[PDB]
Amino acid sequence: AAKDVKFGNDAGVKMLRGVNVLADAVKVTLGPKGRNVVLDKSFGAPTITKDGVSVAREIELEDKFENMGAQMVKEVASKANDAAGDGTTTATVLAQAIITEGLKAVAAGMNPMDLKRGIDKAVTVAVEELKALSVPCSDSKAIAQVGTISANSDETVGKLIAEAMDKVGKEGVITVEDGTGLQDELDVVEGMQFDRGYLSPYFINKPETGAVELESPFILLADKKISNIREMLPVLEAVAKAGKPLLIIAEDVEGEALATLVVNTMRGIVKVAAVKAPGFGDRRKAMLQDIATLTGGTVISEEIGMELEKATLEDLGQAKRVVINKDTTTIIDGVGEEAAIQGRVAQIRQQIEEATSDYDREKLQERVAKLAGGVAVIKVGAATEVEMKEKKARVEDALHATRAAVEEGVVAGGGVALIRVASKLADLRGQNEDQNVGIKVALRAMEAPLRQIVLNCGEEPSVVANTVKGGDGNYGYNAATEEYGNMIDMGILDPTKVTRSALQYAASVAGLMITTECMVTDLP
């Protein structure tokens, strides 16, 4: 199509206006004193929210260039959710501060590549100062306390997450089968988590979570690229006679059958969602064999000779609940019995015995960890359905924050850790001058989220931020109770991975937007 093309500082100020719009809405969502945002829905009454994840999804600007700036920061901040579980808002505010002060410094004629290298230098060293600043979250006391604090101060949720990580292991897979009464049950049921997500967002039937959940679905295990609908039809219509939904685990699903099933979920004819097989090559064939062991069904491969026309209801696998994230699919309570599963585990122990390299044995120890691990039934008991759904959502929030907290340790939250590693790096210098101003842009940006939280309190932000720089360690400003003090003692803590990931991804849009010269889009 006919493209509009902008160069230089025109491109820079267009992206800067887009990041200012997105970043202003998402930044007024940021606080324990966070302000409301009224998002319009054309159905009826609008939705009031305080979460910047829900606000940043709605933002899409009219002018194409400003829209491109907003969609850049939206995209990479959503990567901060997908790697972190929180911190889209913090990565958006940090992204506004690096891009704003950075483009002011480029407008002063400084070299943009030296700014990018300076920002990446202060970001790298500040990441290492977070890892030197992080307190580990190792045992059921710390797992419990991060569970309580993350789930809005409830002890029973932290006891649940501590018991579940105590059972399956901190490395293990924990997702949640929900409640059937008043009691909060918990046990290991046989399933498998693998790092493949949904193929298109149009399979999402639960958009408040951002996932594809299927209850009692069938599972088709295909070791081929699926592009043709004409094989799928006895499976899809055997499902349409069965009524229970259908999950595809294929080598790939491309084009015609893929967007066809997207149209099937558009009209809601047959509930089918599709994901890829985990891994590549012969080990993805072996992992499809393990999923075939769990779900009861059978690998349909070209070496056997079977096709999807010859597939029956026995050939499909089946489970009770599958949950599909953007990058990760978990399968909960497949049909297959402990004789075939356990004998399969013993066969993979045998493959540990006759493996040569240590790396292959590492892959097989990961594979018996997946196959022997198990997923959680965490029956969130409540009095009513409302407390079960809300308490379910708080259990998932404590599950994410506790998961990242036991991955990479925990730091003093509330924007204190960023400004603390900003205070530790005043003497960091680069090679030439524009790296030095890139470092100072980066550190001033690390100050900016505490400035924003205290600004949402209505207090004077430079005073409180200068006092938090005056303190040492985890001394920060509890913005909810407006009290200075030790953030670990006062019970505010963010995982190191949400802070580190927020800073790193804000550095990524920072560098990739400062070093932009040209912008190409369609005409309005």
Identify residues 358-387 at the interface with a second copy (CB under 8 A): 359, 384-385
74 binds a second copy (CB under 8 A): yes
Q: For residue 210, give the amino acid letter.
A: G
Residue 97 CA to residue 123 CA, distance in Å, equals 13
Q: By CB under 8 A, tell whether 179 contacts a second copy.
A: yes
Instruction: Tell me whether residue 89 is annotated as binding.
Output: yes
**Which residue from 210, 279, 471, 485 is in contact with a second copy, where contact means CB under 8 A?**
279
**469 assigned to a ligand binding site:** no
Strand (E) positions, 254-403? 272-276, 317-324, 329-334, 375-379
Binding of a second copy by 521 (CB under 8 A): yes
Per CB under 8 A, does 273 bind a second copy?
no
Among 9, 10, 75, 473, binds a second copy (CB under 8 A): 75
If the CB atoms of residues 22 and 133 are measured against a second copy, the closer one turns out to be 22
Scanning 55-63, 154-162, 186-194, 327-335 for contacts with a second copy by CB under 8 A, the matching segment is: 55-63
The answer to the question of whether 88 is labelled as a binding residue is yes
Concatenated DSSP letters of 364-394: HHHHHHHHHH-EEEEE---SSHHHHHHHHHH
Site string for a second copy, 191-210 (x = CB under 8 A): --------------x-----
148 assigned to a ligand binding site:
no
Has 27 been labeled as part of a binding site?
Answer: no
Using DSSP, state whether 511 is helix, strand or coil: helix
d(CA 30, CA 76): 18
Sequence-separated (6 or more) residues with CB below 8 Å from residue 462? 451
* Binding to a second copy in span 117-156, by CB under 8 A: none
Binds a second copy by CB under 8 A, chosen from 16, 19, 23, 55? 55
Query: By CB under 8 A, which span of 27-35, 119-127, 144-152, 165-173 interacts with a second copy?
Result: 27-35
**Contact flag: residue 283 with a second copy (CB under 8 A):** yes
184 is in an annotated binding site: no
- For 251, 288, 292, 450, the CA distances from 344, given in Å and listed in that order, are 22, 13, 11, 53
Three-class SS of residue 218?
A: strand
Q: In terms of C-beta density within 10 A (0-12 exposed, 13-18 middle, 19 or more buried), how is residue 397 classed?
A: middle
Q: Which of residues 248-267 bind a second copy (CB under 8 A)?
A: 255-256, 267
Binders of a second copy in range 222-251 (CB under 8 A): 225, 227-228, 230-231, 240, 243
For a second copy, the closer of residues 135 and 480 by Cβ is 480
Please check whether residue 370 is in contact with residue 291, taking contact to mean a CB–CB distance below 8 angstroms: no
Window of 124-132, 221-229, 315-323, 415-423 that interacts with a second copy by CB under 8 A: 221-229
Footprint on residues 304-343 left by a second copy (CB under 8 A): 307
**238 vs 341, beta carbon nearer a second copy:** 238
Q: Which of 3, 141, 310, 349 binds a second copy (CB under 8 A)?
A: 3
Quick check: 60 binds a second copy (CB under 8 A)?
yes
Quote the CA–CA distance of 487 and 411 in Å, as a whole number: 9
Q: Does 349 bind a second copy (CB under 8 A)?
A: no
- Do residues 438 and 119 touch, judged by C-beta distance below 8 A? yes
Residue for token pair 């990565």: 91
Residue 426 near a second copy by CB under 8 A: no
Query: 4, 155, 314, 366: which one contacts a second copy (CB under 8 A)?
Result: 4
Three-class SS state of 354:
coil
Per CB under 8 A, contacts with a second copy among 495-514 are: 512-513
Map residue 476 onto helix, strand or coil.
strand
172 marked ligand binding residue:
no
Q: Is residue 374 a known part of a binding site?
A: no
Q: Interaction with a second copy in 440-469: which residues (CB under 8 A)?
A: 440, 457-458, 460, 462-463, 466
Q: How far apart are CA 179 and CA 283, in angstroms?
A: 36
Q: For residue 451, with 0-12 CB atoms within 10 Å meaning exposed, 13-18 middle and 19 or more buried, which class applies?
A: buried
Gap between the Cα atoms of 256 and 279, Å rounded: 23
The answer to whether the CB of 291 falls within 8 A of the CB of 221 is yes
Give Cα separations from 225 to 248, 257, 438 (angstroms). 12, 10, 47
- The CA-based diameter of the chain, rounded to the nearest angstrom, is 73
- Spatial separation of the C-alpha atoms in residues 426 and 441, rounded to whole Å: 12
360 is known to lie in a ligand binding site: no
Of these, 337, 472, 489, 517, which contacts a second copy (CB under 8 A)? 517
Binding-site residues for ATP sit at 29-32, 50, 86-90, 414, 478-480, 494
Binding positions are 29-32, 50, 86-90, 414, 478-480, 494
